Amino acid sequence: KTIPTFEPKESILKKLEDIKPEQVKKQTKLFRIFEPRQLPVYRANGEKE
Amino acid sequence: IEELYKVISLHENEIQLYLISLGIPKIDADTYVGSKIYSQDKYRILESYVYNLLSINYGCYQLFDFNSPDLEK
């Protein structure tokens, strides 16, 4: 009249321990949006300066 | 009766599967198995071969009175 035992669940516990800590980010270059460029420049009349 | 002894020596959950297999309802087998009267039937199958053994009937032994108050004397 013995009773069956408990079967564990390994697939749930694997999702807890495999959560890595928060990935620390460091930047390597400055966050750039604008860059300088050379354009030709003209006077008030219209000729190239 | 050599099959009903084979059933009793199985598991508790394998007696109930056998009784439901024949056609017995669930509340009747679970009143059998739960009351542990499968355990008492080990001592009524094994004693059923004792009264089968020796014969008070034969060609000649049927004529006499075996419970007579002159044989018991």
All structural domains of chain B, each given as residue ranges with its CATH number in brackets, are 1-64 (1.20.120.1400)
Q: For residue B19, give both structure tokens.
A: 């009784």
From first CA to last CA, the distance across chain A in angstroms is 104
Resolution in A, one decimal? Answer: 3.6
Cβ burial B45-70 (10 Å sphere, 16+ → b, else e): eeeeeeeeeeeeeeeeeeeeeeeeee
Burial-class residue B15 by CB neighbours within 10 Å (0-12, 13-18, 19+): middle
Give the chain B residue whose CA is nearest to the CA of A1: B12
B42: Cα within 13 Å, side-chain hemisphere: 7
B3: Cα within 13 Å, side-chain hemisphere: 2
Residues of B in contact with A5 (CB under 8 A): none
Return the closest-CA partner of residue B1 out of B35, B34, B50. Answer: B50
Return the closest-CA partner of residue B46 out of B17, B71, B20, B9. Answer: B9
| Alpha-carbon distances, residue B69 vs A36, B27, B31, B60, B73 (angstroms) | 135, 49, 45, 20, 6
Residues of A in contact with B11 (CB under 8 A): 2
Q: What is the largest CA-CA distance in chain B?
A: 53
Return the closest-CA partner of residue B29 out of B20, B38, B21. Answer: B20
Experimental technique, in short, is cryo-EM
CA dihedral B11, B13, B19, B25 (to 10 degrees): 160
Q: For residue B49, give both structure tokens.
A: 């071969």
Q: Give the separation between CA A25 and CA B48, rounded to whole angstroms.
A: 84
Query: Which of B10, B13, B40, B42 to probe the A interface (max A CBs under 10 A)?
Result: B13
Q: Give the separation between CA A40 and CA A12, rounded to whole angstroms.
A: 66
Beta bridge partner(s), residue A48: A42
Please report how the helices B26-34 and B12-22 are oriented relative to each other, as an axis angle in degrees rounded to 10: 150
